[PDB]
Ligand binder design. Structure first.
Ligand code: CLA
Ligand code: CLA
Ligand code: CLA
Ligand code: CLA
Ligand code: CLA
Ligand code: CLA
Ligand SMILES: CCCCCCCCCCCCCCCC(=O)OC[C@H](COP(=O)(O)OC[C@@H](O)CO)OC(=O)CCCCCCCCCCCCCCC
Ligand SMILES: CCCCCCCCCCCCCCCC(=O)OC[C@H](COP(=O)(O)OC[C@@H](O)CO)OC(=O)CCCCCCCCCCCCCCC
Ligand SMILES: CC1=C(/C=C/C(C)=C\C=C\C(C)=C\C=C\C=C(C)\C=C\C=C(C)\C=C\C2=C(C)C(=O)CCC2(C)C)C(C)(C)CCC1
Ligand SMILES: CC1=C(/C=C/C(C)=C\C=C/C(C)=C\C=C\C=C(C)\C=C\C=C(C)\C=C\C2=C(C)CCCC2(C)C)C(C)(C)CCC1
Ligand SMILES: CC1=C(/C=C/C(C)=C\C=C\C(C)=C\C=C\C=C(C)\C=C/C=C(C)/C=C/C2=C(C)CCCC2(C)C)C(C)(C)CCC1
Ligand code: SF4
Ligand code: SF4
Ligand SMILES: [Ca+2]
Ligand SMILES: [Cl-]
Lengths: 69, 80, 38, 140, 731, 143, 31, 40
């Protein structure tokens, strides 16, 4: 039900942004276990040691998101 | 040997297979992501444990995990 | 080396035994046990 | 069967095979080359691959795979037909790479899925719930 | 194929490298990970291991007693304890030369000998032992005791006598028998020994196995104990002129409470000690009747813990009986924390309120005892927190402990860790700033601008116990206070011992003590921050949200995600070990410098120079080393040869630990590969081949080995310095 | 009456007087030693001759710790508050990070100057503002 | 006094007993 | 130009400027009013 621009909180526990806020970029069609693409402002940990930033996008499911605006 | 598990949070970007230096991983067909594929670990007896597959993984916390187990000549990377 | 205490002949041979014989025997037994079967 | 190919032109080195190749196991890389070229040896120093077939014996599988990546990423006509086998002291040969004639980077039918967990990472069972067993969260 | 050793781990037995050896030694006691271990067999093996350990303690004690009897001068030491130094045992070393022999024929011995430094002589003397034959029979009896416990441990592994799991998990009955029987009855028996033997021997009345049934320790028998007139037993206590071992100043009292110190021996009165033991025996026997067993009457720990719910906490202490009773790491961490606290307590109470005769004069033995027990306490505390983290890794159940105290501690772990970080930064910043200010101020020839802040709170606390030096007149320092006019038989002796600046009871403190207590606070805060952060993130963090899946100890998680070196809770233990050693170093430096000042009467040096750190660098370390580093020199050898050699030995071991700590595996694996190449290609040596493939030490093994060398060196070098300085100065 | 019997005023301590007769000049002032010897004779000294400071809390020694504490608390609250409000205003500039590396000088100076009222704006934000944040809206790690 | 010559080499026979029992306990715990 | 001001407004330049300014403040304060251990 979530659309583009939906500010949402991540509930994946193991996620780096669990409790943080991210904006939805797109929702892939049915069939995929994690279609909700969420982009973030704070980069995560990904990258080899000493690298610059990290990854600021990940795919989740509807059940793993709490809706804000 | 080491265990190399793959989870349903796989997006099938094939980066961990490209990063593997001992051909432990494969890209098998799947239906859980857009790329319609998933990673697999058929040749785990050749895993050394260099964690490169995890380094090349994009998902928020890795979908592929390497757990270091019983050491052998192949896992210790010995040429002697 | 000497000793006004009684049985001063006991350390005479007991110091080499604790320092040479006992360690060599225990290390040899443990070495054989480490490298057993194959 | 019988591995074929000319050995690369090499003057020798101290980084090659040791007693393991004859006591334990060895590995082999074969590849066809469009011309006599110079490549880097995974064991140190430069060697010359012949035009046509080349067979080279190495001590460890990662060495053959490093040679394969170099063949496929460092030459103008990319060498990607390379094959990697494992040789045992009884002369037995086990074909290894690429497993199903196709590189594992790209999907190919016929491959089973192993080590695949239906659950999420954070959905592993708590260790206390599986203690006094011979298993770990990532195994049940 | 299999290489047999270790039988308890096929993952190791099939390791074809030298690691198989090392790890086989490193995981033998971790019974929980043995192949096919069950909880019941775990407990039974632990039971037998406990029996073996008790036998080992008894054997070591028997060794102490036997060597003191055989090669000591105990009977000569009793004739003149204040001048004759006690000897631990004789030396027999063929490496010795004439100089070393002449140097170590000391303390009136006809052969090379080491002088005792553990105060066991004062112990045995205050206990009532006066001959060599008594020590000998004690050693033999303890041999028999070790034998009994060894046979018990053998018996409890037989199918005919194996305690079951439910028996091991009987917390109520075990607590009852330990509080009432193990603790209470034993303090009762020790009071009985002090009454029948120790006190009569202190007055010159020989009480042995040949006469203890005939001579009552009091002119009145057990009727004053039977009826109720217990003051008969206070009778005439030992006068302030009682000379130890004789009848001069002697009395008939067996239970007093005058407090203070024996005027000659400078220790607690034996009658007060036996009285303390009697009271504590009664208290412990009363405690050991709290929990029900088989007679319905009594408490159950589970219901008490379940009842303590609450509003803001939530589940409270519900299900904590099962939480603690099913996890042995939880029990071990509780035991280790408690025992480390009370070991530090013993250390703090033995130097200040000594209990063995004439041990206050033997300054080296007291320094060594304080250092030893504070180091034991530091080790026990680190181990307690390590086992707490191990519980979190292996045994923690989130659903059975949901919303309880444990789950909430984990739920706001960021607050706890961050506030520990704040208090540590606070303490360190400001204490180091004050020390550096004092140093820079003294350096420029203007020592008047030092920030000297009086330890007002602790001086006030001393005054509350009757200390009138600072003129506080508060509580027991004020005669007009209600607490000081209660008629307690312990007030006069206590005030006389605390207001005579001649012993080690409540030592006068200056601003330097304030600075060093803040340094100690920094050390404790930072070590505890390391340990708590390790235990709370042991189950996971934001780098490894599944760190519990990998176990308590693993190398790392790779260079990915930025780099994950020293990630496990084991790495937190290994980090905290350095800060614990540093905290104990600060402790022992403070204690030893202040006590050297106290013993030499020149407290001015410590009180005036402990404020800037150059004072510690030149007046404590550099100065007291002068004797030690001359135990042997181009001119000969004195009795400090072993201590100087061991000082340098500890330096060497410490640096060798640095070796493993700074340089990390892969470099060494490549080097070892070149050496393997060398061996395979060198003739004649080719006749020989290794059975285990040589490989570099593992990452966790390297941390453990570097830390082991670091700690060995730390302890040995500081022990050498302590002993040599305090013994060459004689305090 | 007889409080701190171990210490005596520096004027009444002979060691302090003897040492202050030879105090060293600090700056170019040849009387810097003399004025230091005159200023430190006020406090309590120890048997050695150096002044001890009393943080007991009594207002007779309010300058030993209370006044420097108040001064530093004010100034450090100023620093923290101006930095925090600068970071928060940076938060809404599309590119906040490169303004955290490259310091917006005018905005920084405007935040800094308006810092003398930090202890009042602090309770202003605490009463119904953004000073304290709800725990459930803060990112945490797995327990 | 001083310990008897015959007395020192009498404790060793008694020590033979805990040696035997520790050997038994070790071998049983290895099982 | 604008880039010169942006360079003059970087983190190291601003931090060293503030540190030097505060250094001057404190040095002059202790020069004219020295040896201020405590407030009378
Ligand atoms: C743990 C107790 C202990 C310790 C640390 C020592 C220490 C020492 N002893 Mg002594 N000893 C002990 C108990 C002990 N003794 C007992 C109980 C006896 C009477 C049976 C003796 C009788 C004895 C003699 C006759 C002599 C020594 C001697 C020595 C010195 C060299 C060792 C040796 O050659 O003799 C070896 C010791 C024995 C044969 C006795 C067995 C020791 C006990 C019974 C067993 C200890 C087991 C214990 C658990 C340690 C195991 C190791 C540990 C890692 C588990 C050494 C400093 C020599 C000496 O005088 O030096 C100058 C020597 O002449 N000991
Ligand atoms: C812990 C017990 C112990 C004991 C009792 C000894 C005793 C002895 N050492 Mg030794 N040492 C030890 C441990 C010990 N060491 C260790 C751990 C090291 C490593 C640092 C050394 C390294 C060391 C060196 C480098 C040397 C000695 C030497 C000697 C011997 C000098 C006397 C001699 O020349 O006759 C020699 C005695 C024998 C060869 C054994 C006697 C056996 C027969 C049957 C006796 C009849 C002497 C018997 C010297 C030596 O070997 O003497 C030439 C010598 O060069 N030691
Ligand atoms: C009254 C009956 C009784 C008594 C005598 C004991 C006795 C003992 N039990 Mg047992 N047990 C009992 C019944 C009893 N049990 C019951 C009913 C159960 C449950 C069904 C258990 C189940 C149980 C288990 C599972 C275990 C024990 C263990 C132990 C031993 C504890 C460890 C130890 O030896 O340190 C001795 C401790 C003390 C003497 C207390 C010291 C007081 C503290 C430390 C302060 C020190 C004070 C003082 C200053 C120290 C002196 C210093 C000196 C140098 C001057 C101990 C000897 C453990 C063991 O070792 O197995 C054999 C163990 O694993 N018990
Ligand atoms: C008070 C008794 C006590 C008991 C019975 C245990 C029990 C145990 N500990 Mg523990 N621990 C203790 C004290 C104790 N500890 C203390 C004082 C410390 C602080 C140094 C620690 C710190 C600690 C750590 C960090 C670890 C253990 C580990 C273990 C387990 C395996 C032990 C092993 O095989 O290592 C082998 C012992 C050696 C190789 C000895 C070498 C060192 C010598 C003395 C030098 C075991 C069940 C290990 C474990 O299994 O983790 C789950 C582990 O990693 N302990
Ligand atoms: C003298 C050696 C030393 C120093 C100064 C520190 C410093 C610190 N350690 Mg550390 N540690 C050390 C040894 C040392 N460690 C060793 C050998 C180990 C074993 C590997 C550890 C392992 C360790 C762990 C595991 C932890 C610490 C922690 C800390 C911090 C706690 C804050 C504090 O203590 O108070 C305040 C700080 C200090 C006293 C030191 C800084 C003071 C300087 C001089 C201020 C001036 C800065 C300077 C002007 C900057 C400009 C320099 C310019 C010229 C280039 C702190 C910054 C704990 C922590 O991080 O707490 C949150 C933490 O968990 N340490
Ligand atoms: C950081 C700000 C600062 C402040 C507010 C002052 C304050 C003052 N300075 Mg000063 N000065 C400073 C920086 C500062 N100085 C620095 C960094 C230097 C080193 C180059 C000097 C060198 C300096 C000189 C040469 C003189 C002053 C002088 C003065 C006084 C006029 C005045 C109270 C004058 C003075 O006090 O005469 C002695 C004067 O002649 N200062
Ligand atoms: C007595 C004198 C002491 C001599 C000690 C010499 C230490 C030698 C250490 C070896 C590394 C040195 C090479 C560094 C180059 C290097 O690569 O180092 C190693 C490290 C590289 O880390 P990474 O591998 O993660 O970097 C890869 C990145 O490029 C990713 O793209 O760089 C750093 O240390 C960052 C810290 C910079 C610290 C910034 C402070 C700036 C200081 C300003 C003042 C300079 C001094 C002026 C002269 C007075
Ligand atoms: C002296 C130590 C120096 C500083 C160390 C750090 C002190 C920590 C204080 C920070 C504030 C704690 C926040 C509590 C958070 C909080 O309020 O939780 C809520 C809690 C409500 O508990 P309940 O009413 O549910 O109690 C029922 C219980 O049976 C179940 O827990 O409050 C209390 O427990 C009472 C007061 C808190 C007691 C906290 C203990 C803190 C230790 C202080 C020193 C202990 C000494 C014990 C000696 C016997
Ligand atoms: C019939 C009976 C009773 C009479 C009992 C009689 C008639 C005697 C009772 C004797 C008792 C209960 C003796 C207890 C003895 C314990 C001893 C002797 C020693 C224990 C020592 C230990 C464990 C280790 C000691 C060590 C050694 C050996 C050393 O040498 C150095 C110190 C240390 C390291 C501590 C009464 C009417 C009462 C009650 C009714 C029943
Ligand atoms: C006075 C006195 C004293 C002390 C006392 C005490 C003990 C106190 C305390 C206290 C406490 C117990 C506290 C706690 C708290 C909490 C909190 C929570 C706070 C904080 C907060 C906040 C929120 C902040 C904010 C800010 C500001 C305002 C500014 C800057 C920036 C910032 C952001 C940081 C002494 C003895 C020393 C001396 C005498 C008297
Ligand atoms: C991690 C963990 C753990 C551990 C923990 C620990 C290690 C802790 C600690 C710690 C400690 C170690 C603590 C202690 C403390 C303290 C206290 C508790 C206090 C007391 C108090 C009081 C109350 C006192 C009083 C008094 C005074 C003041 C003086 C005079 C006398 C009197 C008594 C009056 C466990 C396993 C468990 C669980 C899991 C997790
Ligand atoms: S790198 Fe990770 S997400 Fe990509 S294919 Fe491999 S396991 Fe799947
Ligand atoms: S750990 Fe190394 S060898 Fe094993 S799967 Fe990952 S990249 Fe391949
Ligand atoms: Ca007697
Ligand atoms: Cl020398």
């Amino acid at each position: 039900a979530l659309n583009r621009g939906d500010k949402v909180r991540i509930k994946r526990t193991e996620s780096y942004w669990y409790g943080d806020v991210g904006t939805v970029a797109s929702v892939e069609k049915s069939g995929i276990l994690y279609p909700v693409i969420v982009r973030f402002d704070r980069v995560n940990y990904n990258g080899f040691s000493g690298s610059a930033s990290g990854v600021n996008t990940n795919n989740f499911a509807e059940n793993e998101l709490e809706l804000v605006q | 040997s080491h265990s190399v598990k793959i989870y349903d949070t796989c997006i099938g970007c094939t980066q961990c297979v490209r990063a593997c230096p001992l051909d432990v991983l494969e890209m098998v067909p799947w239906d859980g992501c857009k790329a319609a594929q998933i990673a697999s670990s058929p040749r785990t007896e050749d895993c050394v444990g260099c964690k490169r597959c995890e380094t090349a993984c994009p998902t928020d916390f890795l979908s592929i995990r390497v757990y270091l187990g019983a050491e052998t000549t192949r896992s210790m990377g010995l040429a002697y | 080396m000497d000793g006004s205490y009684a049985a001063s002949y006991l350390p005479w041979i007991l110091i080499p035994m604790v320092g040479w014989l006992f360690p060599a025997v225990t290390m040899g037994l443990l070495f054989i046990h480490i490298e057993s079967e194959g | 069967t019988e591995l074929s190919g000319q050995p690369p032109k090499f003057g020798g080195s101290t980084g090659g095979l040791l007693s393991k190749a004859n006591r334990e196991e060895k590995y082999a890389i074969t590849w066809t080359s469009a011309s006599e070229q110079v490549f880097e040896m995974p064991t140190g120093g430069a060697a010359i691959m012949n035009e046509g077939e080349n067979l080279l014996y190495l001590a460890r599988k990662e060495q053959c795979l490093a040679l394969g990546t170099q063949l496929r990423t460092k030459f103008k006509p990319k060498i990607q037909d390379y094959k990697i086998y494992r040789v045992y002291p009884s002369g037995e040969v086990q074909y290894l790479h690429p497993a199903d004639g196709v590189f594992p980077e790209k999907v190919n039918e016929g491959r089973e899925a192993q080590g695949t967990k239906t659950r999420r990472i954070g959905q592993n069972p708590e260790p206390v719930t599986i203690k006094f067993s011979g298993k770990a969260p990532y195994e049940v | 194929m299999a290489t047999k050793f270790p039988k308890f781990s096929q993952d190791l037995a099939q390791d074809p490298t030298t690691r198989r050896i090392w790890y086989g030694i490193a995981t033998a006691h971790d019974f929980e990970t043995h192949d096919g271990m069950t909880e019941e067999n775990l407990y039974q093996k632990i039971f037998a291991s406990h029996f073996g350990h008790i036998a080992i303690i008894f054997l070591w004690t028997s060794g102490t007693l036997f060597h003191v009897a055989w090669q000591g001068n105990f009977e000569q030491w009793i004739k003149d304890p204040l001048n004759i130094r006690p000897i631990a045992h004789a030396i027999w070393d063929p490496h010795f030369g004439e100089g070393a022999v002449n140097a170590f024929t000391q303390a009136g011995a006809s052969n090379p000998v080491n002088i005792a430094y553990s105060g066991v002589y004062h112990w045995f003397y205050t206990i009532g032992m006066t001959t060599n034959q008594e020590l000998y029979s004690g050693a033999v009896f303890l041999l028999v005791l070790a034998s009994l416990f060894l046979f018990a441990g053998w018996l409890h592994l037989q199918p005919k006598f194996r305690p079951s799991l439910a028996w091991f998990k009987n917390a109520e009955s075990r607590l009852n028998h330990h509080l009432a029987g193990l603790f209470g009855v034993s303090s009762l028996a020790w009071a009985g020994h002090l009454v029948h033997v120790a006190i009569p021997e202190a007055r010159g009345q020989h009480v042995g196995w040949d006469n203890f049934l005939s001579t009552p320790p009091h002119p009145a028998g057990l009727m004053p104990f039977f009826t109720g007139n217990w003051g008969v037993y206070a009778a005439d206590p030992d006068t302030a002129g009682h000379i130890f071992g004789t009848s001069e100043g002697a009395g008939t009292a067996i239970l007093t409470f005058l407090g203070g110190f024996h005027p000659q021996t400078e220790s607690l009165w034996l009658t007060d000690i036996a009285h303390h033991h009697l009271a504590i025996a009664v208290i412990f026997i009363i405690a050991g009747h709290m929990y029900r067993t088989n007679w319905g009457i009594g408490h159950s720990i589970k219901e008490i813990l379940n009842a303590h719910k609450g509003p803001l906490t939530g589940a409270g202490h519900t299900n904590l009986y099962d939480t603690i009773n099913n996890s042995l790491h939880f029990q071990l961490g509780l035991a280790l924390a408690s025992l480390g606290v009370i070991t530090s307590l013993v250390a703090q109470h033995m130097y200040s309120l000594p209990s063995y005769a004439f041990i206050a004069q033997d300054h080296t033995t007291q320094a060594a005892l304080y250092t030893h027990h504070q180091y034991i306490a530091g080790f026990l505390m680190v181990g307690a927190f390590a086992h707490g983290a191990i519980f979190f890794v292996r045994d923690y159940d989130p659903v059975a402990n949901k919303d309880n105290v444990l789950a909430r501690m984990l739920e706001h772990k960021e607050a706890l860790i961050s506030h520990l970080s704040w208090v540590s930064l606070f303490l360190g910043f400001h204490t180091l700033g004050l020390y550096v200010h004092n140093d820079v101020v003294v350096a420029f020839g203007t020592p008047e601008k030092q920030i000297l802040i009086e330890p007002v709170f602790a001086q006030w606390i001393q005054a509350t116990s009757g200390k009138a030096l600072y003129g506080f007149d508060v509580l027991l320092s004020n005669p007009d206070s209600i607490a000081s006019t209660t008629g307690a038989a312990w007030l006069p002796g206590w005030l006389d011992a605390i207001n005579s600046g001649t012993n080690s009871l409540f030592l006068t403190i200056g601003p330097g003590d304030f600075l060093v207590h803040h340094a100690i606070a920094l050390g404790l805060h930072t070590t505890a921050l390391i340990l708590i952060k390790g235990a709370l993130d042991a189950r996971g963090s934001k780098l490894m949200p599944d760190k519990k899946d990998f176990g308590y100890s693993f190398p790392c998680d790779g260079p990915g995600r930025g780099g994950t070196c020293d990630i496990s809770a084991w790495d937190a233990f290994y980090l905290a070990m350095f800060w614990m050693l540093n905290t104990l170093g600060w402790l022992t430096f403070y204690w030893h410098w202040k006590h050297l000042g106290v013993w030499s009467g020149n407290v001015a040096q410590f009180n005036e120079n402990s404020t800037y750190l150059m004072g510690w660098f030149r007046d404590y370390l550099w100065a007291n080393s002068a004797q030690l580093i001359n135990g042997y020199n181009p001119y000969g050898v004195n009795n400090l040869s072993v201590w100087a050699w061991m000082f340098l030995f500890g330096h060497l071991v410490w640096a060798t630990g640095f070796m493993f700590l700074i340089s990390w595996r892969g470099y060494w694996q490549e080097l070892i590969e070149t050496i393997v190449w060398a061996h395979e290609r060198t003739p004649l040596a080719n006749l020989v081949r290794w059975k285990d493939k040589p490989v570099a030490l593992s990452i966790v093994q390297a941390r453990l080995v570097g830390l082991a060398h670091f700690t060995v060196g730390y302890v040995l070098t500081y022990a050498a310095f302590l002993i040599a300085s305090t013994a060459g100065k004689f305090g | 009456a007889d409080d701190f019997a171990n210490l005596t005023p520096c004027s009444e301590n002979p060691a302090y007087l003897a040492k202050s007769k030879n105090f060293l000049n600090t700056t170019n002032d040849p009387n810097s030693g003399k004025i230091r010897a005159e200023r430190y004779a006020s406090a309590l000294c120890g048997p050695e001759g150096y002044p001890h400071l009393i943080v007991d809390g009594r207002f007779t020694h309010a300058g030993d710790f209370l006044i420097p504490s108040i001064l530093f608390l004010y100034i450090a609250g100023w620093i923290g508050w101006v930095g925090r409000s600068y970071l928060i205003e940076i938060r809404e500039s599309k590119n906040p990070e490169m303004q955290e590396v490259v310091i917006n000088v005018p905005l920084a100076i405007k935040k800094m100057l308006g810092g003398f009222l930090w202890p009042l704006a602090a309770v202003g934000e605490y009463t119904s503002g953004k000073l304290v944040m709800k725990d459930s809206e803060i990112p945490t790690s797995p327990r | 006094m001083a310990l008897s010559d015959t007395q020192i080499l009498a404790a060793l026979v008694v020590a033979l007993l805990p040696a035997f029992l520790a050997f038994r306990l070790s071998t049983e715990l290895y099982k | 130009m604008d880039g010169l001001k942006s360079f003059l407004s970087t983190a190291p330049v601003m931090i060293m400027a503030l540190l030097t300014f505060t250094a001057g403040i404190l040095i002059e304060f202790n020069r004219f009013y020295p040896d201020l251990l405590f407030h009378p």
